[PDB]
Amino acid sequence: NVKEIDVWAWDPSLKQIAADYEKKTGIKVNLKNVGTNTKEYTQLDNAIEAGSGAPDVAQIEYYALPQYAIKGNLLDITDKTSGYEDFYNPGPWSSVQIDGKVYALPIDAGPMAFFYNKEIFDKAGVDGEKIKTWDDYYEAAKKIHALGDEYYITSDSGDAGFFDSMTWLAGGKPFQTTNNGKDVTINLTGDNGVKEFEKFWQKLLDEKLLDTKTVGWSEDWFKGMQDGTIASLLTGAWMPGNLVNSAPAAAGKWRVALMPTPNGEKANAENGGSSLAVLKSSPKAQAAYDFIEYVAHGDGVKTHVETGAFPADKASLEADYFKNATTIKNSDGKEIDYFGGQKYNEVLAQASADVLTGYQFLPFEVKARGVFGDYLGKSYTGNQPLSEGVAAWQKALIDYGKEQGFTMKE
Numbered sequence: 231n232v233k234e235i236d237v238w239a240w241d242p243s244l245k246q247i248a249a250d251y252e253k254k255t256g257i258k259v260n261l262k263n264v265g266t267n268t269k270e271y272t273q274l275d276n277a278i279e280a281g282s283g284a285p286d287v288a289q290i291e292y293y294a295l296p297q298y299a300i301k302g303n304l305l306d307i308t309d310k311t312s313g314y315e316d317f318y319n320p321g322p323w324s325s326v327q328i329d330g331k332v333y334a335l336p337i338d339a340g341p342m343a344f345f346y347n348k349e350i351f352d353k354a355g356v357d358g359e360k361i362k363t364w365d366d367y368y369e370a371a372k373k374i375h376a377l378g379d380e381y382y383i384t385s386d387s388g389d390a391g392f393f394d395s396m397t398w399l400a401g402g403k404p405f406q407t408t409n410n411g412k413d414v415t416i417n418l419t420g421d422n423g424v425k426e427f428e429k430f431w432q433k434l435l436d437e438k439l440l441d442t443k444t445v446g447w448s449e450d451w452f453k454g455m456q457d458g459t460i461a462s463l464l465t466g467a468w469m470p471g472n473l474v475n476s477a478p479a480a481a482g483k484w485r486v487a488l489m490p491t492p493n494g495e496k497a498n499a500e501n502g503g504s505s506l507a508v509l510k511s512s513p514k515a516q517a518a519y520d521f522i523e524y525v526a527h528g529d530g531v532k533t534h535v536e537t538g539a540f541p542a543d544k545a546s547l548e549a550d551y552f553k554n555a556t557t558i559k560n561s562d563g564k565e566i567d568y569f570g571g572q573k574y575n576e577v578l579a580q581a582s583a584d585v586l587t588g589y590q591f592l593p594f595e596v597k598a599r600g601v602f603g604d605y606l607g608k609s610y611t612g613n614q615p616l617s618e619g620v621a622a623w624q625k626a627l628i629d630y631g632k633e634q635g636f637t638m639k640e
């Protein structure tokens with residue numbers, strides 16, 4: 231009797247894929263973007279608490295899945311997924327499993343890449359294809375800002391996910407969980423990758439080379455990408471779909487290169503990457519699962535790549551529509567040549583191959599990333615050393631873990 235489901239998600243391809251699902255099945259998909267990352271999670275937490283108003287399906291990033299799964303908020307879908315290890319790439323598949331059970335299906339992955347506005351870089355005297363090391367990026371940042379006081383190599387108003395990703399990139403692993411999830415060590419204040427990232431970003435902050443006012447996912451963020459005042463992004467491989475749909479005016483001016491690394495070594499991290507989960511509260515579990523399967527495993531997979539997301543599955547990596555992609559279909563189906571003809575998935579596939587293994591999320595990343603700004607904000611809007619904020623963040627996370635029943639060590 232189910233003729234409609236409710237979905238919360240911000241991935242820009244989901245509107246098209248949901249419309250395609252409606253055409254195929256006759257099931258109405260009531261899709262809402264209720265906020266990006268932590269803004270969505272606040273709303274999901276509120277609906278979970280209230281016992282009412284949750285969607286049947288939500289977009290939940292890999293880093294957030296442990297907290298939701300451990301608390302019993304996601305439906306165990308293990309019995310639907312027999313052959314899925316063979317379908318999905320290993321990182322995404324590992325990330326949807328908590329304590330032996332599958333709680334979501336991967337929909338995209340976020341190996342990082344350096345997206346840059348070639349027009350702005352060239353005008354500033356920077357070769358965006360020659361940014362191999364973090365020092366190269368620092369030197370580029372000075373040249374970009376020399377264009378004028380409003381021009382910055384990128385923006386960072388104080389984002390936890392970026393901090394965590396750059397720690398990973400630099401070889402760090404400040405979070406460890408063992409013993410079926412009961413024993414957690416946090417050593418942000420000692421981890422060498424954290425230290426290396428802090429030293430790098432602290433210099434750019436100190437020299438006022440970053441836009442610390444613009445908040446990610448706001449309109450001014452996309453305006454900056456259009457007008458050149460946010461000249462580049464060190465971010466996940468999902469960015470193309472967002473550039474195409476939300477920064478269309480700069481189409482043709484941007485390019486993709488591999489992430490710069492601390493010393494030019496081959497290394498990468500992931501930033502973001504998402505799954506779709508059925509909420510445990512859903513009275514429409516079968517229809518919710520059927521929708522997720524279409525998006526994440528069936529014909530939605532190809533649509534997702536063609537509309538600018540990076541795949542979570544093995545076959546897409548070998549598919550012609552991935553490897554030989556140049557133009558990206560926007561939300562209206564029009565082919566947009568955002569990267570000026572670049573075979574951008576040649577770079578993104580290499581970016582994925584370069585990701586360092588072994589990194590782990592905390593079992594409470596929704597909490598951890600939600601409070602990052604409480605401890606670190608003054609490092610981005612003020613003079614507080616990053617290292618001081620990180621120490622205060624670690625103490626808060628240890629205390630929270632203990633209060634929630636984890637055995638916490640440093």
Ligand SMILES: OC[C@H]1O[C@@H](OC[C@H]2O[C@@H](O)[C@H](O)[C@@H](O)[C@H]2O)[C@H](O)[C@@H](O)[C@H]1O
Nearest residue numbers: 241242267291391392446468502503504
């Ligand atoms: O296409 C949208 C993608 O959105 C990503 O989520 C946003 C991203 O924001 C960053 O500022 C942050 O550092 C990072 O941790 C993420 O929260 C999703 O991760 C991605 O899968 C796409 O849906």
